[PDB]
Design goal:
The structure is cut from a larger assembly and holds 2 copies of chain A.
Chain A: E1 2-11, E2 19-26, E3 31-34, E4 42-44, E5 48-51, E6 56-63, E7 69-73, E8 78-82
Antiparallel strand pairs in A: 1-2, 2-6, 3-5, 4-6, 7-8
Organism (chain B): Venezuelan equine encephalitis virus (strain TC-83)
Protein name (chain B): Spike glycoprotein E1
Subcellular location (chain B): Virion membrane; Host cell membrane
């Protein structure tokens, strides 16, 4: 992966993966790239994602920080992605806290 | 979802607003008072005529 850009469109921190982040990439080859966040701020729901040649990819994450700025790790390099999340709507969720 | 709004008490004008939460998409909500009625509580006291 070269010339990687991550853009957090809209995020809502909650128990579940209330945050969705979009990453624009320029992959050297078609295929899948393993994706991870070294920091504990958020966890990716997907371990790996298929990459097109020069398309954009979307990921789903859960976090607890209102202003998350985490450097998620991709198959080759890092990219810092920052945005503003929003509080959850429902008071109580029937899900354990991720 | 709790939401508070006030509109002028006039008929024939449709009121447009959106119920918006940061999480969900904003939801259009439209109200148009077709007719507004005011009913006094009358009491028939007596009847008169020629």
């Amino acid at each position: 992966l070269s010339a990687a850009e991550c853009t957090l469109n809209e995020c809502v921190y909650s128990s579940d993966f209330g945050g969705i982040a979009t990453v624009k990439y320029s992959a050297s080859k078609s295929g899948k790239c393993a994706v991870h966040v070294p920091s504990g701020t958020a966890t990716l729901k997907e371990a790996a994602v298929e990459l097109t040649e020069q398309g954009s990819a979307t990921i789903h994450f859960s976090t607890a920080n209102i202003h998350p700025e985490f450097r998620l790790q991709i198959c080759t390099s890092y990219v810092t992605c920052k945005g503003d999340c929003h509080p959850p709507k429902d008071h109580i969720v029937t899900h354990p806290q991720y | 979802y709790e939401h508070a709004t006030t509109m002028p008490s006039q008929a024939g004008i449709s009121y447009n607003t959106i119920v918006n939460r940061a999480g969900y998409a904003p939801l259009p909500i439209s109200i148009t008072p077709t007719k507004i009625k005011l009913i006094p509580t009358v009491n028939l006291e007596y009847v008169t005529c020629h």
